[PDB]
Design a protein around this ligand. Structure first.
Ligand SMILES: Nc1ncnc2c1ncn2[C@@H]1O[C@H](COP(=O)(O)OP(=O)(O)O)[C@@H](O)[C@H]1O
Ligand SMILES: Nc1ncnc2c1ncn2[C@@H]1O[C@H](COP(=O)(O)OP(=O)(O)O)[C@@H](O)[C@H]1O
Ligand SMILES: CN(CC(=O)O)C(N)N
Ligand SMILES: [Mg+2]
Ligand SMILES: [Mg+2]
Lengths: 380, 380
């Protein structure tokens, strides 16, 4: 029982007979997979039984489209990254600016190392936010995890979160028993998540048993939010209105370390290693898993020839006002760090603080009508 | 499905820790599963590694359906129906209107014994269709089949179908070779299976690797078609405009017999036993696998307070114009026999002809300002 009968059954076919048809594909996985790599890795399994087929399924199912390259693969556990390193390493190097198999990732959650960021001009910066994801050692990741493992993650997380006090006193809302009123309240506060609709996620198996053992915790102040068992075991978000990113990041680090110490005592620390930093399902999110950002009104700078170039130079990214696929209603852009792996949490938020400060100074010159042609920084 | 099929850590959790939460689920699986059944069968697997969790996943994920009552489980191979018989048999009994473990599949080949059905009123009955499914013995079914297995089924099936002659002369059209426009036209014209959007198809693992090794075979005038590797290895279809169900059924039965003769001669017989008849993925499609029905315009009858009761009395199922996952458009309903095991093809098509003729007579009475109170049919 509970063995490898399934993969052994597939191994009755030759490697070419099981090899995916990637002729229409444009994703990182398809860029790297070869007939030889598939042949060499198809009989391998992690201790939990995760296989190369499981790693690549989403990339097989979702070819991609013209420009933006999707990753096209997932990890099912920490071991996936080692057992299938011959696939993941080139993907990680390509996705994360050349990060090599021998490179090390530096973690830094000491919020005191951030400099400034309490001052971001409220007239332009409408809100500040820091998000990360975390995995819990001892449990496989959402593509793979059993109902039993998922429930164990939820129990540990909820008991931990229920123990928090002061600024971090809060309450958990299971998706399965959520009242209509609770759901509406969470929507009003931009705290709700629903079953994923993205085929990139659905194709990996991560949505099984929905909504079993999924839920949302937030503190009474509505400034610290935790999603349980969505894309990763945990998603942890600190947010508030205005431009005190210093306070947002402080709260983020303190709450994250409080949770960490409880998990560590239970023998289930956050999944982490010196090479990849914090381990998560998607290779794109390794390292810090961190997206620190602001909603910032850039009426003129938005409509400027070098706007996309300035973001690139500052190592920043932009999205709409309502998320990843939105058109920035009014003039409000979601600006955040582009980096994840090979730089620390402090370094990434510092880039956001420093970069957003410069871009507000730039916009102030533009609304007067001065030239933005000297403040343009070197590529960071 | 997915990696979770072979998650080796399920061993490490208690049965009650892995047991699904089926509270407020309304499908046949959830009506039957118990803690004891789960405990008994959770450590079992078929020779290809299909497990109880794979059987039930769609019924966990899909508590209900917007249009019909669903079975909530699938088979992954022939052996599924034996290994997990204690779950399947009560579901089959419920779904097929009382078919007991001691009852036997029925067929004759006597399609000419259909009484009437050559003259369904074409003002109401816009098209007539008869389908069934077949599985190739020795290959796993769509929820579980590997890319290699699926490809093997496609290769042998196309070779066999290409040997059809006479009114059944046709050819194969691989899904990957169709343009978006060509695919959409075939779907709009009701010939080709939809994009992989069914909650059953998705949740159970049947959409993996799409569109690899899927396609449609058909004769030149598209009156006789075979889908390859959608929900079943084969779906054999006869259809045409208008109300000559007898002719549709003639073509179906003669064609199906030619197919099975060809497959047997090639050494690729279908999955079959004396109890369940022909074995297919969904328990609802066992026995003859036959779903015979019409697109019928019921503007008045569909608004009558006893519409659903009448359908139940007649043992007919209602679906949308674009099939099970769609709504009726322009009051055009897909009306077909609900049950497939414990009766023959002729009995099934006779039940459709008789029921549809009654419903058309009801529609006509309601159009004329008369009532149908006196015409409600006895429970079949
Ligand atoms: N700086 C911000 N201020 C307020 N809300 C934000 C901010 N950044 C993101 N959001 C909100 O969080 C949601 C998720 O955004 P999304 O781009 O998916 O973010 P992430 O991937 O970090 O979760 C959106 O609905 C959006 O309204
Ligand atoms: N009587 C009919 N006439 C024309 N098309 C039909 C008829 N019945 C079903 N269909 C079509 O068959 C396709 C599949 O519908 P679906 O509900 O999935 O049925 P099946 O049991 O064959 O899988 C749909 O495109 C639908 O419009
Ligand atoms: C709609 N189905 C029946 C069911 O889900 O019970 C099919 N496709 N087997
Ligand atoms: Mg997001
Ligand atoms: Mg169908």
């Amino acid at each position: 029982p509970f063995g490898n009968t399934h993969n052994k059954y597939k191994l009755n076919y030759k490697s070419e007979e099981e090899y995916p048809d990637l002729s229409k594909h444009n994703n990182h996985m398809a860029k790297v997979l070869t007939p030889d790599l598939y042949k060499k890795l198809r009989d391998k399994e992690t201790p939990s039984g995760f296989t190369l087929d499981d790693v690549i399924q989403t990339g097989v199912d979702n070819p991609g489209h013209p420009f933006i390259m999707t990753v096209g693969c997932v990890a099912g556990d920490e071991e996936s990254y080692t057992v299938f390193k011959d696939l993941f390493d080139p993907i990680i190097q390509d996705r994360h600016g050349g990060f090599k198999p021998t490179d090390k990732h530096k973690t830094d959650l000491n919020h005191e190392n951030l400099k400034g960021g309490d001052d971001l001009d409220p007239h332009y910066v409408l809100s500040s936010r820091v998000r990360t994801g975390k995995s819990i050692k001892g449990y496989t990741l959402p593509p793979h995890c059993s109902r039993g493992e998922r429930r164990a993650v939820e129990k540990l997380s909820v008991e931990a979160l229920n123990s928090l006090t002061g600024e971090f006193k809060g309450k958990y809302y299971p998706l399965k028993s959520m009242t209509e009123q609770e759901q509406q309240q969470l929507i009003d506060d931009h705290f709700l998540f629903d079953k994923p609709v993205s085929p990139l996620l659905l194709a990996s198996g991560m949505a099984r048993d929905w909504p079993d053992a999924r839920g949302i915790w937030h503190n009474d102040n509505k400034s610290f939010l935790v999603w349980v068992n969505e894309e990763d075991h945990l998603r942890v978000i600190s947010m508030e209105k205005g431009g005190n990113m210093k306070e947002v990041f402080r709260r983020f680090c303190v709450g994250l370390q409080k949770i960490e110490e409880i998990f560590k005592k239970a023998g289930h620390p956050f999944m982490w290693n010196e090479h990849l930093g914090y381990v998560l399902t998607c290779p794109s999110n390794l390292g810090t898993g961190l997206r620190g950002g602001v909603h910032v009104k850039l009426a003129h700078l938005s409509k400027h020839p070098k706007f996309e170039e300035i973001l690139t130079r500052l190592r920043l990214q932009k999205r709409g006002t309502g998320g990843v696929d939105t058109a920035a209603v009014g003039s409000v852009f979601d600006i955040s760090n582009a980096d994840r792996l090979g730089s620390s949490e402090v370094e990434q938020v510092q880039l956001v603080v420093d970069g957003v400060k410069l871009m507000v100074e730039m916009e102030k010159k533009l609304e007067k009508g001065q030239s933005i042609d000297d403040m343009i920084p070197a590529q960071k």
